[PDB]
């Protein structure tokens with residue numbers, strides 16, 4: 001990687017959630033890169049227990065809209081619905097790695113979108129069963145998360161000032 | 177940077193590393209990894225995680241029985257990512273602990289990679305024993321462990337890189 005490139009300052013910290021978008025169409029090659037990032041993500045046992053359902057045509061976007069009650073949601077040009085396949089995900093305890101593995105793919109895709117100058121927001125506040133009904137999703141697959149993305153409106157600042165807990169609050173060394 | 181590509185030049189150069197050399201991990205590098213976790217996004221920004229670092233001999237030895245994999249006791253540093261079910265955002269009968277802790281884990285895995293370190297994401301460990309050993313409160317779960325250090329450059333990846341094709345994993349508009 002470049003000599004002076006810092007992942008934190010130059011890349012992670014420059015990404016804020018974007019909920020307000022302009023009309024500029026997203027280039028095909030940029031959408032394909034985002035999807036490639038998801039495809040190459042690691043997973044437990046490399047089972048890749050995900051499927052990416054892209055919704056960007058008007059009919060599909062309109063169908064998806066009723067799954068959310070957040071006013072900003074229907075304004076996103078592109079949605080990537082990340083489906084987790086319980087039949088394919090590694091088992092642990094009485095559950096599985098669907099939430100873990102899909103979230104790695106979502107993180108890769110979010111970061112890839114950011115690297116290509118797009119804005120996005122990760123969405124989990126939606127009616128999953130309704131999503132499954134509308135898109136004929138098999139019972140054994142769950143829509144876990146949706147990446148809502150497009151070109152951000154540059155006149156709209158981040159929703160609030162950046163805030164996180166202190167490093168002293170979130171880290172313990174050796175013992176809690 | 178001009179022709180720095182996140183996929184070709186960063187994601188694809190990372191493979192899981194399970195075999196490590198003795199070189200100590202610099203404090204500044206460990207702190208950067210933890211900073212990457214801290215600044216990760218999370219549902220409702222609730223940040224329902226806690227990072228338990230285990231790198232001293234007593235701790236590393238105490239943790240070892242939680243893993244059955246031969247390579248695991250070779251890792252110099254473990255970051256045990258705890259998820260807090262009380263604080264995590266709620267959906268249906270569940271919560272975002274596995275989602276959120278995994279975003280933080282991904283940020284830390286990627287940070288380690290950017291700093292010249294090797295690591296492996298570990299979920300195959302005895303979570304109940306881990307909770308007992310480290311007195312983890314009942315409302316918190318150890319979800320994942322990032323095992324990290326300087327990789328042995330003489331050891332290749334465990335297997336050749338393989339993923340499903342793009343056509344297998346993507347559908348446009350309908351399944």
Ligand SMILES: Cc1cc2nc3c(=O)[nH]c(=O)nc-3n(C[C@H](O)[C@H](O)[C@H](O)COP(=O)(O)O)c2cc1C
Nearest residue numbers: 042043044045046100190191192296297298299300
């Ligand atoms: C959620 C998750 C859990 C994993 N758990 C383990 C583990 O317990 N032990 C192990 O040896 N590898 C584990 N891995 C590493 C995977 O085997 C590895 O990421 C996968 O085979 C893809 O290979 P790559 O990381 O080299 O691209 C885990 C990876 C993920 C993402």
Ligand SMILES: Cc1cc2nc3c(=O)[nH]c(=O)nc-3n(C[C@H](O)[C@H](O)[C@H](O)COP(=O)(O)O)c2cc1C
Nearest residue numbers: 015016017121122123124125217218219220221275
């Ligand atoms: C797992 C997850 C689910 C999220 N769900 C939503 C959502 O349903 N609606 C929304 O407006 N924002 C959602 N967010 C965006 C968060 O509000 C945002 O990431 C957080 O406040 C931190 O802000 P930042 O992303 O600008 O750093 C979600 C984020 C994550 C990581």
